[PDB]
C-alpha cells in the first residue's frame, strides 16, 4: 500500500509581551500548528 509522508510539524516561537515597564505576564505564539499538538 502507498503511505504518504509528511515532515514533522514544527514552527517558530513568538512571545507576546506587554512590556517589563507594565508587567511580566506574557503569552506565547506557536506558528502554523494546530493547538492539539503541544
Amino acid at each position: 500500500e502507498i503511505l504518504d509522508i509528511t515532515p514533522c510539524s514544527f514552527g517558530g516561537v513568538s512571545v507576546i509581551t506587554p512590556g517589563t515597564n507594565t508587567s511580566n505576564e506574557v503569552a506565547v505564539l506557536y506558528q502554523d500548528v494546530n493547538c492539539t499538538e503541544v
Binding site: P7, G11, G12, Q31, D32
Partner: peptide
C-alpha cells in the same frame, strides 16, 4: 485572475476581507 524544510510562510497581517473594507 491571479493564480517543507524550514521555509516558513508567515501570513500577512491584514486579511483581504479587511482590505476590501
Amino acid at each position: 485572475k491571479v493564480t517543507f524544510n524550514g521555509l516558513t510562510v508567515l501570513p500577512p497581517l491584514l486579511t483581504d476581507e479587511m482590505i476590501a473594507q
